[PDB]
């Protein structure tokens, strides 16, 4: 349940939903925000697996 809940975390991003990031921001800014979400989700997966 924790791992699923982590999908709703922003990790500092303006939004947790990738489609919102892609819709409102130009590719460059969207790429920065998405890369941040990717980092946060990878950290959550590493924690879960450990």
């Amino acid at each position: 349940n924790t791992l699923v809940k982590q999908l709703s975390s922003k990790f500092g991003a303006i939004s947790s939903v990738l489609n919102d990031i892609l819709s409102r921001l130009d590719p460059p800014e969207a790429e920065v925000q998405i890369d941040r979400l990717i980092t946060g989700r990878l950290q959550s997966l590493q924690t879960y697996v450990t």
């Binding site: 349940n1 699923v4 809940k5 999908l7 709703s8 939903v17 489609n19």
Partner: protein, 296 residues
């Protein structure tokens, strides 16, 4: 080698996309501005606001625009949070002069346009309304004014150019009256003929963010894996009839893990459950390539 191996996961892909938005309310009063008994003057300008629900295809169909140029994408109906519509009837020699950074005699003494505004200037032949050549009251702008105007200078405050060999108060000898027949009298019926001109700035971005272009809705598809967008809430899933009892103000629901599992149809108010499209792992069972190439 002989064994069972974990490979890439499988998904069931959607076959179509659906977009659902609530019933479209009444539209911005663009029709009243263009489909008018008498056109508005520079001082009698309108301010379209808020069930505006702008839709710009009605203007493309309503009248044969001949000099319609949009600084922003002329096709896009998008947002603005305000529409500052303005109107006037002008000679078809000065229509090209209704633009940022242009001067001539017009704009300097009538409706100066600032740089960096969405100047979606529109224009069409007005001879059908100004058919008599005497002169028509309805849409007088300012042909001449004493001094050059700032961008968006007040149109409500009108004047007569104070020209002369002595100080002029407005009307007087060798002063230029804005209500001389001027453009309104067609004469030739080409060229100089009065052209109905509408210009909407679209340039006020502010905290409310209200007025924007109509949002299209597709038919609703159930019992299939589809992509969806419900009032900005997007995703992939299978939509089915719900037994959930939503409150009159709730638009969607969530699970114990804060994921979306239900939506309210914007038009029918039916509650729909969202089941994820099937997925799972794929395992490949092989005797090993040193015995046989048959796999399961």
């Amino acid at each position: 080698e002989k064994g069972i191996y974990q490979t890439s996961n499988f998904r069931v892909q959607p076959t179509e996309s659906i977009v659902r938005f609530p019933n479209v309310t009444n539209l911005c009063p663009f029709h009243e501005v263009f489909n008018a008994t008498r056109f508005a003057s520079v001082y009698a300008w309108n301010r379209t606001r808020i069930n505006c629900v702008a839709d710009y295809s009605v203007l493309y169909n309503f009248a044969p625009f001949f000099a319609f140029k949009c600084y922003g994408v002329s096709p896009t109906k998008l947002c603005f949070t305000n529409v500052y519509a303005d109107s006037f009837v002008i000679k078809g020699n000065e229509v090209s002069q209704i633009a940022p950074g242009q001067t001539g005699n017009i704009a300097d003494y009538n409706y100066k346009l600032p740089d960096d505004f969405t100047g979606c200037v529109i224009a069409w032949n007005s001879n059908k309304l100004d058919s008599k050549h005497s002169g028509n009251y309805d849409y007088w702008y300012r042909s001449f004014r004493k001094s050059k105007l700032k961008p968006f200078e007040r149109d409500i405050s009108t004047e007569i150019y104070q020209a002369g060999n002595k100080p002029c108060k407005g009307k007087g000898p060798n002063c230029y009256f804005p209500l001389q027949s001027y453009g309104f009298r067609p004469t030739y019926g080409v060229g100089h003929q009065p052209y109905r001109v509408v210009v909407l700035s679209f340039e006020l971005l502010h905290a409310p963010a209200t007025v924007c272009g109509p949002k299209k809705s597709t038919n609703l598809v159930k019992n299939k894996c589809v992509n969806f967008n419900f009032n900005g809430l997007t995703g992939t899933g299978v939509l089915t009839k719900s037994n959930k009892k939503f409150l009159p103000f709730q638009q969607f629901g969530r699970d114990i893990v804060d994921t979306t599992d239900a939506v309210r149809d914007p038009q029918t108010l039916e509650i729909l459950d969202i089941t994820p499209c099937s997925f799972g792992g794929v395992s490949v069972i092989t005797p090993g390539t040193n015995t046989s190439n048959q796999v399961a």
